[PDB]
Amino acid sequence: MSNHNHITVQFAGGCELLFAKQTSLQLDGVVPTGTNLNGLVQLLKTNYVKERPDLLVDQTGQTLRPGILVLVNSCDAEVVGGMDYVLNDGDTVEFISTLHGG
């Protein structure tokens, strides 16, 4: 039908409200070889970010706070790089908050 790469950007727990209470999203590109994680997140939050944009970011507005567990292709996203995972169409990224704090 139209299964060409496709991006898997979804949320879990209390992070769905950081976009539009959506279960998952898919982006259609052409040549994301020149794109990285920092560019992927900013494209989802800086481009929309319903809730406080400063509530997810770590501090430099480049990465996210430890409370959220980022994973790529059903695997730890921090291991591969954390904030340097280059995209190439057909990637997967998740944001699940755990550390509530205050």
Automatic annotation (TrEMBL):
Belongs to the URM1 family. There is a cross-link at G102 (Glycyl lysine isopeptide (Gly-Lys) (interchain with K-? in acceptor proteins)). Pathway: tRNA modification; 5-methoxycarbonylmethyl-2-thiouridine-tRNA biosynthesis. This is Ubiquitin-related modifier 1 homolog. GO terms for molecular function: protein tag activity. Gene3D superfamilies: 3.10.20.30. SUPFAM superfamilies: MoaD/ThiS (SSF54285). The modification 1-thioglycine is found at G102. It holds the Pfam family Urm1. Keywords: Cytoplasm, Isopeptide bond, tRNA processing, Ubl conjugation pathway. It is found in: Cytoplasm. CDD domains: Ubl_Urm1. C-terminal thiocarboxylation occurs in 2 steps, it is first acyl-adenylated (-COAMP) via the hesA/moeB/thiF part of the MOCS3/UBA4 homolog, then thiocarboxylated (-COSH) via the rhodanese domain of the MOCS3/UBA4 homolog. One of its GO terms (biological process) is tRNA wobble uridine modification. The lineage of its organism: Eukaryota, Discoba, Euglenozoa, Kinetoplastea, Metakinetoplastina. InterPro entries: Beta-grasp_dom_sf, Mopterin_synth/thiamin_S_b, Urm1. GO terms for cellular component: ciliary plasm; cytoplasm; cytosol; nuclear lumen; nucleus. It comes from Trypanosoma brucei brucei (strain 927/4 GUTat10.1). Acts as a sulfur carrier required for 2-thiolation of mcm(5)S(2)U at tRNA wobble positions of cytosolic tRNA(Lys), tRNA(Glu) and tRNA(Gln). Serves as sulfur donor in tRNA 2-thiolation reaction by being thiocarboxylated (-COSH) at its C-terminus by the MOCS3/UBA4 homolog. The sulfur is then transferred to tRNA to form 2-thiolation of mcm(5)S(2)U. Also acts as a ubiquitin-like protein (UBL) that is covalently conjugated via an isopeptide bond to lysine residues of target proteins.
